[PDB]
């Protein structure tokens, strides 16, 4: 009842945007994708004006993912299609670290919230690599059996990561003992393209089986399956907060689910065969960033 629609409050008309992410204060956001350019925008300027990024950093390869540092305001990590994981400073435009151990494209990077100098990546090379910004070599390496689409730190502790794998499972590791995952969550019927935490104990996933799923990582239980969107092929984006899940669709529509309800609360047609390619809630608010395969960016807000 609370929300029935997504309102468009701003649009930046346009290349696939692989990632759209807010900085630690939800003040700036960044986009990156196939055009090899990490762009930073001021959120309030975008909402209030009738355009230009405040930072543009060119890269050697297409980007798959961005993650802002949760403590250092100005630092943002990227993963790219060459496998390189880079930490950048958006004020100086410097690449601070270039981590080059992955042998194939890296699909994701994630900075830890609670140990903010730690970041984790996953790759088509089937490795999870944990990095520290004060060290050039990886700190932890997990050799897995299938391509890795996403790795995400638990929001409450840097000891736990969720790994979304092409083997259709979520592998939940305690990095203090990587011999076996704590638990492997089965239920998806295709690759797990995203994993995102709603809270310390609640994990969501997306898959190219056209479902989202919710899981309990305290008691290692399946919770719920969400359906309505079309996602059989692409990285279409997943973002969650304390109560809501949002994802893209190959129908060029953004979908929003409340975590207790298996069918969508609402959806938005972006306005061809375009796909939504990136989504990001503004923390626990009804406001969201979205982008699609044409490079269009929209700021949306859930509304009654």
């Amino acid at each position: 009842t609370r929300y029935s629609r997504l309102r468009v409050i701003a649009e930046i008309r346009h290349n696939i945007v692989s990632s759209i992410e807010f900085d630690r204060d939800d003040e700036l956001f960044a986009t990156a994708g196939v055009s090899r350019c990490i762009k930073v925008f001021d959120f309030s300027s975008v909402v209030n004006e009738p355009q230009c990024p405040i930072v543009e950093m060119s890269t050697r390869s297409k980007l798959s993912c961005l993650s802002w540092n949760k403590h250092e305001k100005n630092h943002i990590a990227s993963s790219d299609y060459e496998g390189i994981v880079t930490v950048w400073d958006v004020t100086t435009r410097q690449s601070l670290m270039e981590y080059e151990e992955h042998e194939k494209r890296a699909w994701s990077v994630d900075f830890s919230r609670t140990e903010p100098s730690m970041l984790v990546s996953g790759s088509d090379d089937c490795k999870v690599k944990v990095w520290c910004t004060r060290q050039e070599a990886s700190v932890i390496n997990i050799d897995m059996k299938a391509n890795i689409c996403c790795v995400k730190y638990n929001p409450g502790s840097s000891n736990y990561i969720a790994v979304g794998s092409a083997d259709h499972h979520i592998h939940y590791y305690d990095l203090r003992n990587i011999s076996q995952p704590l638990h492997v969550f089965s239920g998806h019927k295709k690759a797990v393209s995203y994993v995102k935490f709603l809270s310390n104990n609640e994990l969501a996933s997306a898959s190219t089986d056209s479902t989202l799923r919710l899981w309990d990582v305290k008691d290692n239980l399946p919770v719920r399956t969400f359906r309505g969107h079309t996602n059989e092929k692409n990285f279409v984006g997943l973002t969650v907060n304390s109560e809501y899940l949002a994802c893209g669709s190959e129908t060029n529509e953004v979908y929003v689910y409340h975590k207790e309800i298996t069918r969508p609360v609402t959806s938005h047609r972006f306005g061809g065969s375009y796909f939504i390619s990136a989504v990001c809630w503004k923390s626990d608010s009804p406001t969201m960033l979205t982008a699609n395969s044409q490079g269009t960016i929209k700021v949306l807000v859930l509304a009654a």
């Binding site: 696939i16 196939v34 299609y81 690759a191 692409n234």
Partner: peptide, 7 residues
């Protein structure tokens, strides 16, 4: 191919 999930 870009933004295509591994099988």
């Amino acid at each position: 191919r870009y933004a295509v999930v591994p099988d």
